[PDB]
Amino acid sequence: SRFGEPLMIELSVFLCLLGCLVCSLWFLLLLVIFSGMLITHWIVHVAVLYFTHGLKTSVEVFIWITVVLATWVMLIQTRKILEFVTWTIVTVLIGAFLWLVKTTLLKILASSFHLNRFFDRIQESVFHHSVLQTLAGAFAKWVVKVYNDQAALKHALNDNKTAVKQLNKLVTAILIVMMIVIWLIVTGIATTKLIVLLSSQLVVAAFIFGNTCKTIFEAIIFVFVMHPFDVGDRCVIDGNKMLVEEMNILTTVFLKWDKEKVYYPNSILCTKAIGNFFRSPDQGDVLEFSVDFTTPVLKIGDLKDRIKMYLEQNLNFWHPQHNMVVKEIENVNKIKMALFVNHTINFQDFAEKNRRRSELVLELKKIFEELDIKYNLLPQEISIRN
Ligand SMILES: CCCCCCCCCCCCCCCC(=O)O
């Protein structure tokens, strides 16, 4: 596991000049320009940071084609051949448009997923590594924590890139297919019988792949929009405290307290209430106990006072705020009580939580012995027959 483990190449400038040289008069000059008009788009782009760098090339294609179609329209059985060509160009532009849309949406999703959530953890990681580099020119525990946190960020970053690439493949594939169909029908190539068969194929597919498409969509919303947890977070699902090992579109992989690896479908996880200790504020806890009904109220008062002193001597573990609650009188034999305390940590480090609680439980033991707090069973009257 990742967590829990024990020459032509640069001839474009020249090519562009050669293309310009192609005409100096007349009507076909725009058509000729199209052959190397990409250079013009590149220059326009130069003339025109995450989105900018990632999208400029998609924009260039879109506008490039737009111009080619516009000049084509204004340029002019060759009669039917040209109708065909015109529509082919239109289809190509539609394709580029959709391409641009697709790219944009994935860039938004991919970026906002992390940029608006853990920017600050990245900066903390950089800081500590700068410090380690400087130092090189409980210390060891600190050093290990710094490396483990960096690894966690690397894993989150890689899983996001992977998930986005998977989305990219699904969308690209459907986009390509629909563009083929669009081309065939707008150009007039497909005939009536072909339209009928394509129509049927789509309808049938709509049923077959219906649940699949819905499931993927819901999984995307769960993972990227709701985002109840990240990689490495300790989460609670139906009472199971589990560490998130990996996130994917269809599944989330978790490690149980005993490090069993669990594959948990997102289509199910989407309907559950999910806890997240990593994202929690300092967490609290409870120690329940019972005392005899005859315990003097003064000993109850001494118990409260002794507990307060303990907690105040250990402020690295406990917040000063606590409550002692008397809850119930059972028969006239038992008083049920509970101690409510506040930890100075959240429970991402579960073992540390238990160690601190364990000491508090032993302190309670000690206080009861010193104050002579006891619990007795009710007496039983016996009658003897011979
Ligand atoms: C149902 C159509 C495909 C869905 C999109 C591609 C896969 C999305 C990611 C899900 C996890 C599959 C890849 C990891 C498999 C493994 O554990 O080796």
Strands (E), 222-351: 234-237, 240-247, 251-255, 261-265, 274-276, 284-292, 318-330, 334-343
Q: Assess if residue 33 is contained within a domain.
A: yes
Q: How far apart are CA 23 and CA 1, in angstroms?
A: 64
Q: How many angstroms is it from 250 CA to the middle of ligand 1? A: 6
DSSP state at residue 223: I
Using the atom order of ligand 1, give the atom closest to the CA of residue 250.
10
Residue that terminates a domain, selected from 276, 297, 316: 276
Q: How many residues does the chain have?
A: 386
Q: How far apart are CA 142 and CA 153, in angstroms?
A: 17
Q: Are residues 83 and 167 in the same domain?
A: yes
Exposed e or buried b for every residue in 238-255, given b needs 16+ CB within 10 A?
eeebbbbbbbebebbbbb
Q: Are residues 54 and 146 in the same domain?
A: yes
Strands 334-343 and 284-292: antiparallel
Using the atom order of ligand 1, give the atom closest to the CA of residue 253.
17
Q: Are residues 108 and 65 in the same domain?
A: yes
Q: Are residues 15 and 101 in the same domain?
A: yes
Q: Are residues 43 and 158 in the same domain?
A: yes
DSSP 22-70: T----TTHHHHHHTTTHHHHHHHHHH--HHHHHHHHHHHHHHHHHHHHH
Break-preceding residues in the chain (C–N over 2.5 Å): 6, 25, 48, 76, 137
Q: Are residues 38 and 168 in the same domain?
A: yes
Q: How far apart are CA 10 and CA 100, in angstroms?
A: 27
Q: What is the resolution of this structure in A?
A: 2.7
Exposed e or buried b for every residue in 203-231, given b needs 16+ CB within 10 A?
eeeeeeeeeeeebbeebbebbbeeebbbb
Q: Are residues 183 and 237 in the same domain?
A: no
DSSP state at residue 226: I
Whether 172 lines ligand 1, by a CB cut-off of 6 Å, is no
Q: Are residues 23 and 40 in the same domain?
A: yes
- The sign of the torsion formed by the CA atoms of 336, 342, 347, 350 equals negative
Please state the domain count of the chain. 3
Q: Are residues 244 and 290 in the same domain?
A: no
Element (H, E) at 181: helix 139-186
Q: How many angstroms is it from 158 CA to the middle of ligand 1? A: 15
Q: How many Cα atoms within 13 Å fall on the side-chain side of residue 78?
A: 1
Contact 342, 282 (CB under 8 A): yes
Tell me the CA distances in angstroms from 25 to 14, 28, 31, 159, 165, one per residue in order: 21, 10, 13, 56, 48
Determined by cryo-EM
Contact 96, 62 (CB under 8 A): yes
| Of 168, 248, 254, 262, best ligand 1 pocket probe by most atoms within 8 Å of the beta carbon | 248
Q: Are residues 45 and 160 in the same domain?
A: yes
For residue 339, count CB atoms less than 10 angstroms from its CB and return exposed for 0-12, middle for 13-18, buried for 19 or more. buried
Structural domain of residue 199, as residue ranges? 9-123+138-208
CATH for 330: 3.30.70
Per-state percent for the chain, helix, strand, coil, to nearest 5: 60, 15, 25
Tell me the CA distances in angstroms from 140 to 128, 143, 147, 353, 383, one per residue in order: 13, 5, 11, 21, 70
Q: How far apart are CA 355 and CA 347, in angstroms?
A: 12
- The phi and psi torsions of 100 (rounded to 5 degrees) equal -60, -40
Q: Assess if residue 216 is contained within a domain.
A: no
Whether 162 lines ligand 1, by a CB cut-off of 6 Å, is no
Give the list of residues 6+ apart from residue 50 with CB closer than 8 angstroms, or none.
Answer: 107, 111, 115
For residue 233, count CB atoms less than 10 angstroms from its CB and return exposed for 0-12, middle for 13-18, buried for 19 or more. buried
Q: Which amino acid is at 206?
A: A
| Largest separation between any pair of C-alpha atoms in the chain | 136
- The phi and psi torsions of 290 (rounded to 5 degrees) equal -135, 150
Given the structure tokens 């700068």, which residue do they identify?
130
| Nearest C-alpha neighbor of 334 from the set 275, 302, 376, 362 | 376
